[PDB]
Amino acid sequence: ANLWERFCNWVTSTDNRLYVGWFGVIMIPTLLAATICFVIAFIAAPPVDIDGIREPVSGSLLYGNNIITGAVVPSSNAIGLHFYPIWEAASLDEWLYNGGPYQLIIFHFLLGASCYMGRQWELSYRLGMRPWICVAYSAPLASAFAVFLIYPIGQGSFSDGMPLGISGTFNFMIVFQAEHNILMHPFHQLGVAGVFGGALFCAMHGSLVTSSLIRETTETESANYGYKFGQEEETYNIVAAHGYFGRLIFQYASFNNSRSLHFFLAAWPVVGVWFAALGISTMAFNLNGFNFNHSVIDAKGNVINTWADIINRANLGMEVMHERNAHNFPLDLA
Amino acid sequence: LSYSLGALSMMGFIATCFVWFNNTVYPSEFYGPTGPEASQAQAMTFLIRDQKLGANVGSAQGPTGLGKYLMRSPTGEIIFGGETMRFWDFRGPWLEPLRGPNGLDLNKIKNDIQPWQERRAAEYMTHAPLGSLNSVGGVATEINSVNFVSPRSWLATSHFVLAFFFLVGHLWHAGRARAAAAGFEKGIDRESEPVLSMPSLD
Amino acid sequence: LLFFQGFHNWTLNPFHMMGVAGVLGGALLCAIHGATVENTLFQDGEGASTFRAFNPTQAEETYSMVTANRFWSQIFGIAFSNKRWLHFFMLFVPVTGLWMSAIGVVGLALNLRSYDFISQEIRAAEDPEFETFYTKNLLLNEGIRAWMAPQDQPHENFVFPEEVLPRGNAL
Amino acid sequence: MEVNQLGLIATALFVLVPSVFLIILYVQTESQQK
């Protein structure tokens, strides 16, 4: 066996503690780069002029942030969607003033996570599994693309990409509400049903299986010791759990098929989150949430407010206050 | 089928960007102004207005210290001021007559702006591709009155959705194609479970 | 939701944050567990649609826990090995999440908010060049409060003249 | 910055006390007759 052959055999080896694989060949360096840059920046990066108006925002710990306020700050509005690698800056000091760490991190991370998905496919193949775990992973991945790549493209600047930080995330959500009324967008609503629902079903499944565990232990020991890793017998009575749930609602609202049930458990949150991602991705091209502003009108023509109009007032607050020095003209068009 | 689904995904993303940015094969006369285009057009509109009122737009300093109407690109070209600084790559037939070798030309701005340009900039500024799902034109906070969502928004959003689901379809059918060709798409052989014939990880 | 953002800065609250971690983590577990079971199934029928290849009365596991465990051990570094623990955990994460969120709201009942970081405010008040996403979001909250209060709280009979409304440039 | 001066000892005990609890239970578990 030649050198390249051996190398290929190691790369794709089912025996490595962590699987490498060809997707992993791209994954490992890109994710390391993104990780290292992110840690160093989060700790020690100087303030960044996110909105290209010479008003630098401090994101790092050493420059006045804690964990909750800290962020790696998005690249400058002056840059727009321009590619700004380290070697495009005249100096690292410039690079940092203009928010280069952000581009470095989100591109390495996006490539890396894409390869992470591919690697899930790859290992499933190497182990003789069915292939679609990666498809489930496509939902959070797509979300990440939505907020880090797509929305910046639609709005024409990485300065509007989601900040790599907690409070900055909140900033992104509030501004997004201001300009897109995302709460009134059915794809975000499907996203909420996705995650509220996924949480619900998580608790329900968890509690039903836990409820029907077959007695295998004493009261003085954890019931978990009643399951042994690899045992061929199922560790709970699904007939009992089905009897329970079926009687909780009615029989034909309950799953008697574990496969059908688990497929549901995959599909509901995955599809929901897919719609959340598509929500951000299409609001990226300014197709916004439902606008029922001033929709109800009395017989003279007086506006009769609905809850929609109160939402609109809130949105106005956010709109007028956000990026308070960045707009010179009356319409915030991007 | 999976190969073609991947290809179509790719093409859908591409068409999204095409209808969103290009105004050559998607003329703004028919499809409306691009996002960049309308933002630029606003800058232009208010430059024209204020300059009519007597303002020197080249030397007008905005609140940030950056020019209120005109500023430089990161490589020095003269570009429109305000947030539309992001959109300085925009090019369109109504703006280019004002463009010199170094970008926007201040003399050309002062002396050479024809009424048709003011018109076009006003039109495009007021038909920016912003609007609601029930086709209320404008920012999310605008009141009902204008029935408008740009064709560029409709095309871009529709095709990003379709391209995405088509990527999903490519992962699905690719993975399935692999599994089925290798013969375990229906599940694991209990009497021949591969992981059981593998050395433990630890 | 928007009221709680503007008046309580609810997103800054670590109990809400634990809530979010519980709901999103819950959703994640829902997804990852369902998908994993569906993709470590034993071939128990001849069908290409594999749902009929399961008997509700059958004794044997319908999917391979061992293969699932190796897969995730190699993908993510760690994996469930115990089914009972897995399903208990699935109960624990969202239930705990919602409970924490509750505690936070009980705080908000008294206006006992996590609204500010005092050190942040002292620095920013003394230094007009110090800016963070924290202070940015407070500006947003201020806008929300002043622009929504009059119609949202009509019993207060608020009249805020134009000139007092907080606004940035132009908008 | 003008942080709370008890923040450090608060964080320190918040981590150390329970972590130590767990370490004690773990180590005495390992030492039990296998």
């Binding site: 503690r17 962590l18 840690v39 700790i43 710990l61 050493l62 804690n66 964990i67 042994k228 890793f229 690899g230 045992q231 | 433990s200 990880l201 630890d202 | 061992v66 465990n69 051990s73 570094g77 760690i78 994996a79 090995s81 | 910055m1 942080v3 923040g7 450090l8 964080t11 320190a12 981590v15």
Partner: peptide, 30 residues
Amino acid sequence: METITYVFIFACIIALFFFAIFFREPPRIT
């Protein structure tokens, strides 16, 4: 001290990742 604390807790977490992954109790089939 704030920064030192934050960075320290983070570092402990990363170290925990290391031990939990490479020094886990190995799963064993019965």
